Amino acid sequence: SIQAEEWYFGKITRRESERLLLNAENPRGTFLVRESETTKGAYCLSVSDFDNAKGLNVKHYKIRKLDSGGFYITSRTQFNSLQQLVAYYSKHADGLCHRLTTVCP
Numbered sequence: 398s399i400q401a402e403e404w405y406f407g408k409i410t411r412r413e414s415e416r417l418l419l420n421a422e423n424p425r426g427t428f429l430v431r432e433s434e435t436t437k438g439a440y441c442l443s444v445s446d447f448d449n450a451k452g453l454n455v456k457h458y459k460i461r462k463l464d465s466g467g468f469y470i471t472s473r474t475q476f477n478s479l480q481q482l483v484a485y486y487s488k489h490a491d492g493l494c495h496r497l498t499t500v501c502p
Contacts, residue, residue: 414431414443431443
C-alpha cells in the first residue's frame with residue numbers, strides 16, 4: 398500500500414518533481430513516485446540523472462497498473478506491487494537513466 402511509502406509523493410506535478418530533483422546535492426538515481434498528470438490510474442517515476450553533456454537533469458517514466466494487478470514500466474517486466482517494482486529498479490538500470498538510489502528529499 399503505496400501512499401504509506403516515503404518515496405510516494407502522491408499528487409504533485411511534473412514541474413514540482415523537477416524542482417525537487419534538480420537540487421545540486423542529489424546524486425544520480427534520486428527518485429520519487431507520483432500520480433501521472435493526465436493518465437488515470439497511472440503513476441510516474443521521476444528520476445534524477447547527471448552527465449557532463451547535460452549536467453543535472455530529470456527523466457519521467459510512466460508506470461501502468463493492470464486490473465489483473467500487475468505494475469510495470471515495460472509490459473515485458475511486471476511486478477505484483479509498486480514496492481517490488483521499486484526494489485527491482487534499485488538493482489537494475491535496464492532502460493532507466495540510472496538505477497534507483499535514494500528517495501528525493
